[PDB]
């Protein structure tokens, strides 16, 4: 993770679209390292959001220099269907997946665990799901999450996979995750705040 840190936030809290998309594009490949086909459709959905945002950006990178520019330009371009359109909608969902990853990783780094099963990551994933995604899912998708949770790797195995080849301890691995989390968390928080400020957030369930 720490090979692709996000940029620090500038004083004006603007997030450059190009570097943001470049950074977060390194996250979906991690889903191929979790040891299950159950992660295939997940990877697909997150990558699909990234692809959509990049496709809008590519139409005019200067116009879409920042994530704020995307929202404001699309609000002007689309009128009534906005924010349920375009890159605004894609980023609305992407931020939820990014927040899931943030909460999950932070929970692991913070030593949160089921003391009865300290080498599982279920409690960490459940917390992340509850905080990031659950209320945007109808009861059927929530039931699917609960089933998919059983496909999660052991903690020790997950941390091994995050540091393969590097010959580092788990303690060192977790320090590098904490480093990644600094600008990552700050960036996601700014994106959420922007959605509030722009009245671009929707609450529909799938």
In the complex, the residues that contact a copy of itself under the rule CB under 8 A are 36-38, 40-41, 44, 140-141, 143-144, 147-148, 150-151, 206
CA distance 194 to 152: 32
> Is residue 83 a contact residue for ligand CIS (CB under 6 A)?
no
Residue in the structure block whose two tokens are 């997030």? 15
Q: Are the C-beta atoms of 35 and 157 separated by less than 8 Å?
A: yes
Residue in the structure block whose two tokens are 């957030």? 201
Q: How far apart are CB 37 and ligand CIS at their closest, in Å?
A: 4
Q: Are the C-beta atoms of 94 and 24 separated by less than 8 Å?
A: yes
Known binding residue 187? Answer is: no
The one among 121, 159, 188, 200 contacting ligand CIS by CB under 6 A? 121
User: In the 3-class helix/strand/coil scheme, how is 78-133 assigned residue by residue?
Assistant: HHHHCCCCHHHHHHHHHHHHHHHHHHHHHHHHCCCCCCCCCCCCHHHHHHHHHHHC
Q: Which does 150 bind (CB under 5 to 8 A by kind): ligand CIS, a copy of itself, none?
A: a copy of itself
Q: How far apart are CB 45 and ligand CIS at their closest, in Å?
A: 4
Scan residues 146-205 and list those touching ligand CIS (CB under 6 A): 148-149, 152
The one among 30, 66, 78, 186 contacting ligand CIS by CB under 6 A? 30
Which backbone phi and psi does 146 adopt, to 5 degrees?
-60, -40
Known binding residue 70? Answer is: no
Known binding residue 52? Answer is: yes
Convert residues 38-57 into a mask of x (bound to ligand CIS by CB under 6 A) and - (unbound): x--xx--xx-xx--x-----
> Which amino acids are annotated as binding site, given as ranges?
45-52, 137, 204
């Amino acid at each position: 993770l720490a090979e692709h840190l996000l940029k620090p936030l500038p004083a004006d809290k603007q997030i450059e679209t190009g570097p943001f998309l470049e950074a977060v594009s390194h996250l979906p490949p991690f889903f191929d390292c979790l040891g299950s086909p159950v992660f295939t459709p997940i990877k697909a959905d997150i990558s699909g959001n990234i692809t959509k945002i990049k496709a809008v950006y590519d139409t005019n990178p200067a116009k879409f220099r920042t994530l704020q520019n995307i929202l404001e330009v699309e609000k002007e371009m689309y009128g009534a269907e906005w924010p349920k359109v375009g890159a605004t909608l894609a980023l609305m969902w992407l931020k939820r997946g990014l927040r899931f990853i943030q909460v999950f990783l932070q929970s692991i780094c913070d030593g949160e665990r089921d003391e009865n099963h300290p080498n599982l990551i279920r409690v960490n994933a459940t917390k992340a799901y509850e905080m990031a995604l659950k209320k945007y899912h109808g009861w059927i998708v929530q039931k699917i999450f609960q089933a998919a949770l059983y496909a999660a790797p052991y903690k020790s195995d997950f941390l091994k996979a995050l540091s393969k080849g590097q010959n580092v301890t788990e303690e060192e691995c977790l320090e590098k995750i904490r480093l990644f989390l600094v600008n990552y968390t700050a960036t996601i928080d700014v994106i959420y705040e922007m959605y509030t400020q722009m009245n671009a957030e929707l609450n529909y369930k799938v």
